[PDB]
Design a protein around this ligand. Structure first.
Ligand SMILES: [Zn+2]
Ligand SMILES: [Zn+2]
Length: 94
């Protein structure tokens, strides 16, 4: 059996991708701006307007009116419930 025709597929290509790997080329180690306690709107990571910052009566966390979609056209005259808790029934998971 002499089936040695001899046909190599010698076809190269310059496959080069320089993956620039600067882990902190624009990422500084941020220090704790709120070391003790400060009611910050965790949706916007900032306590922008404290006068528009609500605290869920049936939870505990700081939200802005602005940070919710759509922004709360009326400021809650009574204690504000988070939309999570607003969808309740007699049977809680307790
Ligand atoms: Zn906010
Ligand atoms: Zn709640």
């Amino acid at each position: 059996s002499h089936m040695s025709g001899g046909s190599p597929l010698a076809t190269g290509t310059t496959a080069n991708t320089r993956g620039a790997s600067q882990k902190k080329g624009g990422e500084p180690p941020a220090l704790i701006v709120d070391p003790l306690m400060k009611y910050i709107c965790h949706i916007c990571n900032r306590g922008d307007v404290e006068e528009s910052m609500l605290l869920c009566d049936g939870c505990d966390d700081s939200y802005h009116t602005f940070c919710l979609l759509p922004p709360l056209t009326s400021i809650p005259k009574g204690e504000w419930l988070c939309p999570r808790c607003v969808v309740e029934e007699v049977s809680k998971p307790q």
